Design an enzyme around this catalytic site. Structure first.
Site, PDB file in Angstrom:
ATOM      1  N   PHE A  27       0.809  -1.209   0.000  1.00  0.00           N
ATOM      2  CA  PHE A  27       0.000   0.000   0.000  1.00  0.00           C
ATOM      3  C   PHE A  27       0.845   1.264   0.000  1.00  0.00           C
ATOM      4  O   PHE A  27       0.377   2.313  -0.454  1.00  0.00           O
ATOM      5  CB  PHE A  27      -0.914   0.010   1.221  1.00  0.00           C
ATOM      6  CG  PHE A  27      -0.172  -0.003   2.524  1.00  0.00           C
ATOM      7  CD1 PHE A  27       0.182  -1.199   3.121  1.00  0.00           C
ATOM      8  CD2 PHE A  27       0.182   1.179   3.147  1.00  0.00           C
ATOM      9  CE1 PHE A  27       0.869  -1.217   4.313  1.00  0.00           C
ATOM     10  CE2 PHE A  27       0.871   1.166   4.340  1.00  0.00           C
ATOM     11  CZ  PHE A  27       1.214  -0.035   4.925  1.00  0.00           C
ATOM     12  N   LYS A  29       4.138   3.259   2.585  1.00  0.00           N
ATOM     13  CA  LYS A  29       4.869   3.216   3.840  1.00  0.00           C
ATOM     14  C   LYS A  29       4.230   4.143   4.868  1.00  0.00           C
ATOM     15  O   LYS A  29       3.446   5.033   4.537  1.00  0.00           O
ATOM     16  CB  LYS A  29       6.345   3.581   3.630  1.00  0.00           C
ATOM     17  CG  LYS A  29       6.577   4.882   2.893  1.00  0.00           C
ATOM     18  N   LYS A  46       0.777   8.000   6.824  1.00  0.00           N
ATOM     19  CA  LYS A  46       0.719   6.923   5.848  1.00  0.00           C
ATOM     20  C   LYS A  46       0.641   7.500   4.438  1.00  0.00           C
ATOM     21  O   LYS A  46      -0.216   8.336   4.142  1.00  0.00           O
ATOM     22  CB  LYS A  46      -0.478   6.014   6.122  1.00  0.00           C
ATOM     23  CG  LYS A  46      -0.820   5.094   4.967  1.00  0.00           C
ATOM     24  CD  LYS A  46      -1.376   3.760   5.426  1.00  0.00           C
ATOM     25  CE  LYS A  46      -2.735   3.871   6.037  1.00  0.00           C
ATOM     26  NZ  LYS A  46      -3.324   2.531   6.163  1.00  0.00           N
ATOM     27  N   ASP A 143      -9.575  -7.679   7.936  1.00  0.00           N
ATOM     28  CA  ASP A 143      -8.124  -7.806   7.906  1.00  0.00           C
ATOM     29  C   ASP A 143      -7.553  -7.651   9.314  1.00  0.00           C
ATOM     30  O   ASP A 143      -6.795  -6.729   9.607  1.00  0.00           O
ATOM     31  CB  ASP A 143      -7.506  -6.788   6.963  1.00  0.00           C
ATOM     32  CG  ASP A 143      -6.076  -7.095   6.657  1.00  0.00           C
ATOM     33  OD1 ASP A 143      -5.661  -8.241   6.902  1.00  0.00           O
ATOM     34  OD2 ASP A 143      -5.367  -6.195   6.177  1.00  0.00           O
TER      35      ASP A 143
HETATM   36  C1  LIG Z   1      -1.203  -0.240   8.072  1.00  0.00           C
HETATM   37  N1  LIG Z   1      -2.120   0.788   8.507  1.00  0.00           N
HETATM   38  C2  LIG Z   1      -1.831   1.686   9.456  1.00  0.00           C
HETATM   39  N2  LIG Z   1      -2.806   2.544   9.784  1.00  0.00           N
HETATM   40  C3  LIG Z   1      -2.534   3.376  10.763  1.00  0.00           C
HETATM   41  C4  LIG Z   1      -1.308   3.418  11.472  1.00  0.00           C
HETATM   42  C5  LIG Z   1      -0.973   4.241  12.550  1.00  0.00           C
HETATM   43  C6  LIG Z   1       0.248   4.168  13.219  1.00  0.00           C
HETATM   44  C7  LIG Z   1       0.565   4.973  14.337  1.00  0.00           C
HETATM   45  N3  LIG Z   1       1.711   4.915  14.997  1.00  0.00           N
HETATM   46  C8  LIG Z   1       2.627   4.036  14.568  1.00  0.00           C
HETATM   47  C9  LIG Z   1       2.448   3.204  13.507  1.00  0.00           C
HETATM   48  C10 LIG Z   1       1.229   3.240  12.789  1.00  0.00           C
HETATM   49  C11 LIG Z   1       0.916   2.413  11.694  1.00  0.00           C
HETATM   50  N4  LIG Z   1       1.894   1.461  11.243  1.00  0.00           N
HETATM   51  O1  LIG Z   1       3.044   1.843  11.106  1.00  0.00           O
HETATM   52  O2  LIG Z   1       1.534   0.313  11.040  1.00  0.00           O
HETATM   53  C12 LIG Z   1      -0.349   2.474  11.027  1.00  0.00           C
HETATM   54  N5  LIG Z   1      -0.612   1.605  10.008  1.00  0.00           N
END
Ligand SMILES: CNc1ncc2cc3cnccc3c([N+](=O)[O-])c2n1
Ligand SMILES: [K+]
Length: 336
Positions: A27, A29, A46, A143
């Site tokens: 998707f 980074k 994101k 998911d």
């Molecule tokens: C894959 N979707 C997704 N959505 C929201 C997210 C919010 C985050 C917030 N603080 C750290 C990592 C965060 C990540 N992350 O790195 O996986 C997120 N990832």
């Protein structure tokens, strides 16, 4: 296309300054950014890859996270809070609150060791209370995996464990939140046919339609991986997947085999799997009946696996719900 606009030092929307990378994928980074219009608050951004599959998913997520942040302005049910979105160099960007390591990455960086049972108990409750919040609002995550359960803060304490003879990290505070809502689906929205392989429910593999029950199956696979420290269904082949299930849980229900559109997997209403083949012998010896995975026979271990067993019910119409599961005695120790 993307590796050129997400470097340490870049400034997006004349506001956020990139620090380091939190995670990569197909998707796009996720990067940790210094918000300069807010005193220096670190955040997460994101950066969605410029693809129609992922640009539309980001658009489907921004909607859902507007509904879920209105209905819950305080994050009582522990969904991640979205703050803002904007285009950047033709790429959709979503700004979230900064969380800690995902539950998957913690296990990985800890040598693939399991969580303590009381930590599993608290984490399982917050996951259930969170996803059941979505199920009350006519939603399904589809998911749910350890990469989407993030620690509010992943700080730990380290010591030497002379039982396993290794350094072992131990979480200080294990509160979690749920992320990634780009595949969520309202009850009336179009249900697409394919929804990750290791956490896919049996009704999905067999293509029979799905709803909130399929999310409960995913939580069962997450809980057993918190307990063991490794994936219980580690494969990419669909027929091997179903074969692993029959070794851990038992034979599939007959009325589900008869209704599948995937006649390729079966022959004469039974899984066309040769036990004495090449891979059939790895499945027979890597997998075992679910109850035999228990590391102890103490009652609290019995109660977790009774919850996991009811979560891994094949028939989605018979599978436990999340409302029922929040009352299960495995969570008795948290209440007054
Ligand atoms: C894959 N979707 C997704 N959505 C929201 C997210 C919010 C985050 C917030 N603080 C750290 C990592 C965060 C990540 N992350 O790195 O996986 C997120 N990832
Ligand atoms: K489809």
């Amino acid at each position: 296309s993307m590796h050129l606009i997400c470097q340490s030092g870049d400034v997006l929307s004349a506001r956020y300054e990139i620090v380091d990378t939190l995670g990569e994928g197909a998707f796009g980074k996720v990067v940790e950014c210094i918000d300069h219009k807010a005193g220096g608050r670190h955040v997460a951004v994101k950066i969605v890859k410029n693809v129609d599959r992922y640009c539309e998913a980001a658009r489907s997520e921004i909607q859902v996270l507007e509904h879920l942040n209105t209905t819950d302005p305080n994050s009582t049910f522990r969904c991640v809070q979205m703050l803002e979105w904007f285009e950047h160099h033709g790429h959709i960007c979503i700004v979230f609150e900064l969380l800690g390591l995902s539950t998957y990455d913690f296990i990985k960086e800890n040598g693939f060791l399991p969580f303590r049972l009381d930590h599993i108990r608290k984490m399982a409750y917050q996951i259930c209370k969170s996803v059941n919040f979505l199920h009350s609002n006519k939603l399904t995550h589809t998911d749910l995996k350890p990469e989407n359960i993030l620690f509010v803060q992943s700080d730990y304490t380290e010591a030497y464990n002379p039982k396993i003879k290794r350094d072992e990290r131990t979480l200080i505070n294990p509160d979690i939140k749920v992320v990634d809502f780009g595949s969520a689906t309202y009850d009336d929205e179009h249900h697409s046919t394919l929804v990750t392989r290791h956490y896919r429910a049996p009704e999905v593999i067999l293509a029979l339609g799905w709803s909130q029950p399929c999310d409960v199956w995913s939580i069962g696979c997450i809980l057993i991986e918190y307990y063991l420290g490794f994936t219980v269904f580690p494969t990419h082949d669909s027929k091997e997947h179903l074969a692993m299930m029959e070794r851990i849980l038992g034979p599939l229900p007959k009325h589900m085999i008869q209704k599948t559109r995937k006649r390729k997997y079966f022959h004469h209403d039974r899984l066309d799997w040769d036990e004495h083949s090449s891979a059939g012998r790895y499945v027979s010896r890597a997998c075992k009946p679910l109850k035999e995975f228990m590391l102890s026979q103490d009652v609290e271990h019995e109660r977790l696996f009774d919850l996991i067993q009811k979560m891994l019910e094949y028939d989605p119409a018979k599978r436990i719900t999340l409302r029922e599961a929040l009352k299960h005695p495995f969570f008795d120790l948290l209440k007054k």
